[PDB]
Write a protein that binds this ligand. Structure first.
Ligand code: CYC
Ligand code: CYC
Ligand code: CYC
Ligand code: PEB
Ligand code: PEB
Ligand code: PEB
Ligand code: PEB
Ligand code: CYC
Ligand code: CYC
Ligand code: CYC
Ligand code: CYC
Lengths: 172, 96, 162, 231, 172, 172, 162, 162, 172
């Protein structure tokens, strides 16, 4: 896996170059807003159980078909496996938020996942609905001003929204 | 040039393409040339290597003709065995 | 699953062996018991609608806060009364599945596997379902060795919740 | 508590008997500490375990675990703990776990720890959720504690590719290091410092690969090296 | 794996339904013929070595090129693997006769066996001849009354002959 | 694996034959070459690190893109794995030289190598140039007369260079 | 194959090594023995049918019930005598293969592997083939180191049947 | 140690085998070549001091910075010159141990296992030891198959350092 | 494990010495004894099934309490292990004959065998009786001059008998 800092290094090593001064300065801009990046994954982790179980409820209620007998998530095994798939994906989005890039999200979580759901018979479009229901649930928490100094985090929140969106198009 | 040195076996030339081009003494692979046939034990129709005693599967691996990089490996995906018998009438009428 | 027939094949296949008389005596004990298990599965099915609503009303008397307290996990709304009742019909259906197969095979894959993650996530207390299963054990109306087979899989589901 | 999901078996060589008393040259060299080896022969157990878990190309000096080796030389850990300690090692996580997904990492560790191929594709799907929910330390413990490991290798034998060649044949199944390399066709593209994915053979104006013909004087050279004596 | 009774429950769970009265009485019909089904598998496994070694001996007299030099059952290891495979096929057929369905026979015996035999050069059409020789050596013995009470169990014999026919067409 | 004396036994058995006197007389012509065959693998084994590094040094002098940043033999772990491949191929050509035929080279080394290099992105046409430079380093060493009695081993030089040709067409 | 050549390649390849002088000496010991070991195979092949029809008659002398008793397993028919002299020639041909290869390679693959399962199924007693190999061990007529090579593979076949 | 005798036992114990003719021929190849290698070990032992002082001087002519550069790794002091001629004697002694045993077994156990951590830590260069071993190869004065045996173990030590 | 040539080398390295000419000339005497040593090992390995079976049958003749019901050789699984244990020891004695010293007999056969037999309840004194009946069955066979040149090899039969005494006092 790579973070945002080692992404620039691995690209620079394939050209045999040192880093330019505008690449160090773009890296030190990530360090300047590093405290606001940590406040975002503090809000998401602390409510991570409530993000999964409220969006699945709007999901299980949202599509009645998933839990119907003969449906994919009917029985304890298929319904509890739907809950842990949401908790895996929500976990690997927060790994991509403190890293800075979506390299741990793509390698460890999204690689080969569309073809796995096709082999299982899992409706892949409905998994994208559950990821999008977790997207706005954690964006609404990220924009909460409780326990923080007031500032502008709007470019960081629009980056967290891009990690859930990448997970939702990589699964259908 | 024509393989003259024993020093240019590693430099220029590779190995004989056909077994009629082998070294003085050996087969195409380089091993010693031995006649293929020995004395048959138990000449007998019912019990014995008749004309229709099926081929050894270990005759090719032992040859080294199953491995694709070896020259003995013939691929039968493009030979006449892989073409449909047109005298079969299930295949003619469907393809008409 | 956990049929006695599949639990006799699985021991012979592990050794890579044929079916000896050790296995045929095991399957014969299934067949000498299934005349009581199939009279219990038909008697619970024909009295199901009395048993579901009676067990669902019994947990409202024992725990009256479910019909009053707000929240999606309680039976205070018309959407909620159905889920607790549906679980009651889901528990009774796996009981009658386990009687026609013999042994706790169907309710393992369909009800028990992953049950603890469901009750933890959606905040459903397993003592609500124990009160419902104790109603069915009291008043299924059966007797003799017919009631012994029905209470054997009721108490298996109680032992997994407790 | 989420059991593993059920998959179907498949016909393989190791599921069925070879009636082979007196094995030959394709018998694959049990390396065991039940034969009480000396110091020169416990080096060969360690190299065989490195070759099996890592590649031959990952037996560098920076890869070797010198403290896991010295606990095997003092009879503190078994060979099942050496094999577990190589999978949870920092070189294996860096060179193999980070450049595969969860499904191709299962088939590497099935082929190299259990010594057999996967049964089907659903077996990769069934085991890849043991990694994602418990980690590598939980996945390698539930894989070494199967009855497939404790019956074949026990706790004092190095694993090997079980039953690769059939006793009559000269061409056997592909070795598991040539069949499954470090990374595959995904992660090849640009995640592993790669360009253009193929290459034509090297052209040259001095041909270097001329086949000899039937009158060439090197086919008769044949005595070439040295003339015979006598009268 | 599934047996016959667990197959009916798997149909009924996928529709979310209780079992009907006719599905109960169809299951109590299989209980009634349980002693005649146990009597068949006892008749087959008690003679299991004689079914194999006589159906093989008839095969090599009918197709004599299989034991000639170069034939596929010519050496002592190739001869002993032939008798191994007939014993494996007859073992899983005996498993499928007490279960009531061919779930263990398809999954644990036949899955990938045709592709195994093509890669070996084993003639798959000759393996089907030896399975049909084991079919009517077992059917003729299951119809033998020496030791059983007299009665008609011909529906069970037509079921046992279908497991042998299933493995015969799934090997070529 | 097969050696050269075991290749004639497998052909003979496949037709259920004895070995004639013409075939035995051709196997004692293979024995009389026995000490010259052992000198050739001794000269390749004793100089085995100068075969590999002199021909790798030659490989990057004339294809200098392989060790530039972004190449395949760049970043010294991939440089060390590149020299490992050349010692591996030289090991199995040495095995096929005492055996008298290339069957241990065919399935333990070359089987699946062309498809391995395509999954790694390694230029398989440049691996064949690496094998071809060890080919004439090993041939010039085996034509070299130092440490050997007078006599003849020139049909064996042409055989050793044919295993290097076998290894080089299987990888392109 | 249990050739001394393929056993040398296997010990080098077990530890990923080049062929040192440990393995070249094993190959050299095959070549020093291959002179006497190849004149034995030439003389056993030339007296093949004399030794096969002689050894078949020695089994019918010691075991005369094998020509009288009815059944498929015995040499009481014209087909049972053809299949009996087929099997004497099988054991003789594998001995000569081991003499041209060096070491008990062909006998282990083609003859010994699976022999015990065959001799149990078809009811072939292994004492018949021991008597047939003891005849060839006494009647091949060789001497010196040529008989010493020949008898080492007759004796290896007797130890597998015994 | 890896000897030709313990590598024939280990391949027979792996197969659960008695010592066949595959293994007796391999031990016989050791006994044939042991006449040429026991005189190489006798001739290298008796002329050892001529070879040690010669081979240490051959390093000093080729790499003369090792006598001039100050520091504990170099042969610039009298202490560091006796530690050099010590090490040349260690390499020559292991070569004679491999000639009497047959096979590169004594130096695989006593010398090469852990050698790279010694040269890295104490900053010793493996090209100093290659130059010393290339002197002994060219100056041992053997000829025939006696020099062929000695040079095959000199070149094993060079290939582990190169 | 060690042979006799590496036993004298492991003792010279521990004092940092070259081998003296007396130890070299004592080793070349062992080399010219080498053809007589391979005759003794060949004479045992070719009679190995009759050394085991006769000395077993002679053991349960004079000790019928072993195979009487309740004995430690009754119930053929225990009878199959008594024949395996006789074959193992005769195997590892013939291994220590070609080696010249009993380092392979000591570790991978005899270390922990008195401890194993005392754990199971095997009478270890009866095992020593059976080992001394294969001693004089194979001392008698190595003194047989059938198919050998008549010379003197009395010093190697006194060596082979010592490895049988070594294994017999190690289990009591
Ligand atoms: C009389 C039978 C015919 C025949 C058989 C034959 N088969 C083989 C080899 C194999 N058979 C299997 C079969 C199975 N493996 C399994 O795991 C299962 C249960 C799921 C089965 C049924 C396998 C894996 C092999 C290959 C490995 C091995 O041989 O052990 C052979 C082997 C010899 C050969 O070279 O083919 C024979 C002879 N062949 C015939 O001619 C008969 C028609
Ligand atoms: C100078 C050589 C060229 C080159 C080589 C290169 N190869 C690799 C990686 C592998 N090579 C193999 C090959 C074998 N493995 C075997 O077991 C055998 C038979 C015994 C052979 C022939 C395999 C399996 C791999 C990948 C597995 C691994 O490395 O662990 C690499 C490194 C690839 C990487 O980045 O990890 C290199 C650099 N590359 C070149 O550019 C040269 C042309
Ligand atoms: C040719 C002389 C060159 C040289 C030699 C030199 N060596 C050392 C130190 C050590 N050498 C060893 C090597 C071995 N020890 C072993 O037991 C074996 C196997 C039998 C080998 C190969 C070791 C362990 C040391 C360090 C301990 C010691 O022996 O004192 C030194 C001293 C280095 C120091 O820092 O003290 C020298 C000078 N160096 C040269 O310059 C010569 C060219
Ligand atoms: C962005 C979505 C928020 C917001 C964030 C800001 N936080 C600022 C400082 C700050 N942030 C944290 C939380 C975080 N930093 C840590 O070190 C750790 C734990 C290791 C965590 C969880 C802390 C503790 C601090 C205090 C340090 C400081 O005062 O700088 C910050 C800058 C402060 C400022 O602008 O005055 C911002 C903007 N603010 C928002 O309005 C949205 C809601
Ligand atoms: C049909 C193919 C046969 C046949 C079968 C019948 N068997 C009958 C009764 C019966 N069979 C057994 C054997 C079996 N049952 C077991 O429990 C065990 C092992 C523990 C075995 C091996 C038993 C014990 C019984 C007694 C039960 C009884 O008396 O019914 C039977 C009677 C009627 C029925 O069961 O429906 C039949 C028809 N009889 C035949 O004629 C053919 C050959
Ligand atoms: C061929 C490419 C060489 C060459 C080879 C010759 N070698 C001859 C005899 C010979 N070679 C060895 C060493 C070899 N045998 C072994 O057992 C081992 C391993 C321990 C090795 C390396 C020995 C011992 C002998 C002596 C055999 C004898 O005395 O006959 C040789 C002799 C002529 C012949 O056998 O007809 C030749 C030609 N000589 C060359 O000129 C090229 C370069
Ligand atoms: C000793 C207890 C025996 C006995 C041994 C003798 N053998 C003598 C010579 C000899 N033996 C062999 C066969 C051996 N060498 C091999 O390479 C192999 C396997 C491949 C075997 C079985 C050969 C080839 C030779 C001739 C070479 C030589 O002379 O060393 C021998 C010398 C005669 C004498 O001086 O008496 C003895 C003593 N002979 C016996 O009488 C007892 C029974
Ligand atoms: C829930 C929102 C949806 C759903 C889920 C569902 N998932 C499965 C099964 C699996 N899911 C995975 C997922 C992953 N594996 C990984 O390794 C990673 C990281 C790369 C992820 C994200 C895997 C491997 C499985 C199969 C393993 C298993 O069977 O447990 C199921 C199947 C349960 C079953 O019994 O078949 C279900 C139902 N399906 C839905 O309906 C929701 C839309
Ligand atoms: C003759 C000495 C005695 C005898 C022979 C006899 N043998 C058979 C049947 C078989 N023999 C074999 C043996 C081999 N097959 C091999 O491929 C090899 C290695 C190359 C060996 C040793 C086998 C497989 C069979 C069965 C198949 C076949 O017909 O060949 C029979 C027929 C028995 C039957 O039931 O068909 C007979 C009569 N029997 C005697 O009485 C003689 C004393
Ligand atoms: C037979 C003449 C005497 C005899 C033998 C006997 N031994 C056993 C059991 C074991 N023997 C061993 C010994 C070894 N196993 C090995 O792998 C090796 C090589 C290192 C040796 C030396 C072991 C481990 C066992 C126990 C395992 C097993 O049961 O096979 C038995 C069986 C004892 C039992 O009750 O299981 C017998 C009968 N016993 C006699 O009475 C004879 C005097
Ligand atoms: C076959 C195995 C199986 C079981 C057992 C199961 C349990 C189960 N019960 C659930 C919900 C629930 N279960 C109950 C049940 C109750 N809570 C109360 O207040 C009462 C005391 C009690 C009624 C007896 C309730 C109230 C919910 C809330 C579901 C929601 O609102 O989303 C859910 C969440 C999804 C849903 O069904 O809506 C599951 C999976 N589902 C299965 O597939």
């Amino acid at each position: 896996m790579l973070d945002a800092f080692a992404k620039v290094v691995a690209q620079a090593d394939a050209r045999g170059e040192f880093l330019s001064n505008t690449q160090i300065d773009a890296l030190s801009k990530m360090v300047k807003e590093g405290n606001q990046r940590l406040d975002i994954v503090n809000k998401v982790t602390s409510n991570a159980s409530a993000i999964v179980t409220n969006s699945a409820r709007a999901l299980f209620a949202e599509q009645p078909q998933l839990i119907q007998p003969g449906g994919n998530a009917y029985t304890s095994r298929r319904m509890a496996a739907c809950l842990r798939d949401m908790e895996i994906v929500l976990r690997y989005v927060s790994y991509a938020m403190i890293a800075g890039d979506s390299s741990v999200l793509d390698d460890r979580c999204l690689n080969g996942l569309r073809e796995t759901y096709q082999a299982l018979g899992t409706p892949g479009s409905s998994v994208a609905v559950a990821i999008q229901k977790m997207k706005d649930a954690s964006v609404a928490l990220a924009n909460d001003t409780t326990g923080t100094p007031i500032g502008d985090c709007s470019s960081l929140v629009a980056e967290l929204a891009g990690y859930f969106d990448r997970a939702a198009v990589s699964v259908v | 040039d024509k393989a003259r040195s024993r020093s240019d076996w590693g430099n220029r030339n590779v190995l004989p393409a056909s077994e009629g081009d082998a070294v003085l003494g050996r087969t195409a692979k380089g091993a010693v040339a031995v006649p293929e046939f020995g004395i048959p034990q138990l000449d007998d129709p019912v019990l014995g290597f008749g004309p229709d005693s099926m081929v050894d599967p270990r005759i090719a691996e032992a040859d080294g003709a199953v491995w694709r990089w070896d020259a003995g490996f013939v691929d039968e995906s493009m030979t006449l065995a892989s073409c449909a018998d047109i005298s079969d009438e299930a295949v003619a009428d469907e393809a008409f | 699953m956990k049929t006695p027939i599949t639990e006799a094949i699985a021991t012979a296949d592990n050794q890579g062996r044929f079916l000896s008389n050790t296995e045929l005596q095991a399957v014969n004990g299934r067949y000498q018991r299934a005349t009581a298990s199939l009279t219990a599965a038909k008697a619970l099915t024909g009295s199901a609608q009395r048993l579901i609503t009676g067990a669902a009303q019994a947990v409202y008397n024992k725990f009256p806060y479910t019909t009053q307290m707000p929240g999606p996990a309680y039976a205070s709304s018309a959407i909620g009364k159905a889920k607790c009742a549906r679980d009651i019909g889901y528990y009774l259906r796996m009981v009658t599945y386990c009687l026609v197969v013999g042994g706790t095979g169907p309710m393992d894959e369909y009800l028990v596997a992953g049950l603890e993650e469901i009750n933890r996530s959606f905040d459903l207390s397993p003592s609500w379902y124990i009160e419902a299963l104790q109603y069915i054990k009291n008043s299924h109306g059966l007797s003799g060795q017919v009631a012994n087979e029905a209470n054997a899989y009721i108490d298996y589901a109680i032992n997994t919740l407790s | 508590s989420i059991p593993i999901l059920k998959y179907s078996l498949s016909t393989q060589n190791q599921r069925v008997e070879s009636f082979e008393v007196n094995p030959g040259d394709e018998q694959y060299r049990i390396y065991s500490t039940d034969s009480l080896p000396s110091s020169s022969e416990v080096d060969q157990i360690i190299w065989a375990a490195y070759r099996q878990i890592f590649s031959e190309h990952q037996i560098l000096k920076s890869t070797k675990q010198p403290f896991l080796e010295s606990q095997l030389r003092f009879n503190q850990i078994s060979i099942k703990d050496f094999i577990k300690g190589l999978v949870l090692s920092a070189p294996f996580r860096d060179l193999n776990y980070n450049v595969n997904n969860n499904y191709r990492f299962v088939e590497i560790c099935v082929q190299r720890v259990l010594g057999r191929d996967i049964y089907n594709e659903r077996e990769k799907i069934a085991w890849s959720i043991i990694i994602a929910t418990q980690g590598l330390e939980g996945f390698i413990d539930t894989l070494l504690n199967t009855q497939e490991y404790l019956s074949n290798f026990g706790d004092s034998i190095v694993p090997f590719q079980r039953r690769r060649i059939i006793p009559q044949r000269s061409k056997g199944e592909m070795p598991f290091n040539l069949k499954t390399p470090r990374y595959g066709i995904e992660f090849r593209s640009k995640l592993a410092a790669t360009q253009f994915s193929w290459a034509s053979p090297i052209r040259r104006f001095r041909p270097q690969e001329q086949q000899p013909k039937a009158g060439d004087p090197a086919l008769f050279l044949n005595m070439v090296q040295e003339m015979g004596p006598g009268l």
